[PDB]
Structures are given as C-alpha cells and as structure tokens.
Swiss-Prot record, chain A:
Quaternary data: Homooligomer; predominantly forms a homooligomeric arc-shaped pore complex instead of complete rings of 16 subunits.
Domain writeup: The MACPF domain includes the central machinery of pore formation: acidification causes a significant structural rearrangement, leading to oligomerization and deployment of the transmembrane beta-strands (named TMH1 and TMH2) that enter the membrane as amphipathic beta-hairpins.
Inactivation phenotype: Impaired immunity characterized by a failure to efficiently prime CD8(+) T-cells to cell-associated antigens. Defects are caused by impaired cross-presentation of cell-associated antigens. In normal conditions, mice do not show any obvious disease phenotype or a change in immune cell frequencies.
Protein name per its UniProtKB record: Macrophage-expressed gene 1 protein
Superkingdom of the organism of origin: Eukaryota
Induction annotation: By CSF1 in fetal liver macrophages. By interferon-alpha, by interferon-beta, by interferon-gamma and by bacterial infection with E.coli and M.smegmatis in embryonic fibroblasts.
Record's subcellular location: Cytoplasmic vesicle membrane
Tissue spec: Expressed constitutively in a variety of cell types including macrophages, microglia, neutrophils, T cells, marginal zone B cells, keratinocytes, splenocytes and intestinal epithelial cells.
Role of this protein: Pore-forming protein involved in both innate and adaptive immunity. Plays a central role in antigen cross-presentation in dendritic cells by forming a pore in antigen-containing compartments, thereby promoting delivery of antigens for cross-presentation. Also involved in innate immune response following bacterial infection; shows antibacterial activity against a wide spectrum of Gram-positive, Gram-negative and acid-fast bacteria.
Posttranslational modification: Proteolytically processed in two steps to generate the Macrophage-expressed gene 1 protein, processed form: cleaved by trypsin in proximity of the helical transmembrane domain releases the ectodomain into the lysosomal lumen to orient the pore-forming domain toward the endogenous membranes, and processed by the asparagine endopeptidase (LGMN). Proteolytic processing in antigen-containing vesicles is pH-dependent.
Family: Belongs to the MPEG1 family.
Species of provenance: Mus musculus
C-alpha cells in the first residue's frame, strides 16, 4: 500500500494532508489511520 | 526499512513502523530594546573686583 510506484511513474509529490486518520478530540491530536489508503 | 516508506512530501525515508503527521509550523519572536540617557551639565561663575 505504498505510493512509491506512482511517484516513480508520475514524478509528483503526494498530498501530505489526508483524511481517514483517527483524531483524539480530548488532546486534539492525530492518531493512526482508520480507513485504508491504497 | 523493508517497504522503503517515505513521508508524503518526499523529503525523508522513514521506517515501516512509524507514520508522520506534517505540521510545518514556525514561530519567530524578536524583541529589541534600546535605552539611551544623556545628561549634560555646564557651569561658569566669574567674579571681578576692582
């Protein structure tokens, strides 16, 4: 589930801000992703 | 480093067991303070007797 193949093909950066991750609302901080990103 | 995982911005190589949240924040604080004092005193007394 790595993007390195697409980077090799397209030579573009990956959008570094992505949804799907968990969010600790008490501490307002990101945690490991819940939805699958392929 | 089996998967040759990389940060999304393509800046760094990271181990497969970590993930990076990109929070590219900068804080700058510059405080400058200049104090200058100048006191000049001048006196001149002159007495003449004839």
């Amino acid at each position: 589930t790595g993007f390195q193949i697409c980077k090799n093909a397209l030579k573009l950066p990956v959008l570094e801000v992505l949804p799907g991750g968990g969010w600790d609302n008490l501490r307002n901080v990101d945690m490991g992703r819940v939805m699958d990103l392929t | 480093y089996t998967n040759c995982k990389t940060t999304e911005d393509g800046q760094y190589i990271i181990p497969d067991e970590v993930y990076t949240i990109p929070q590219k924040e900068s804080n700058l604080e510059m405080n400058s303070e200049v104090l200058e004092s100048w006191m000049n005193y001048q006196s001149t007394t002159s007495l003449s007797i004839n």
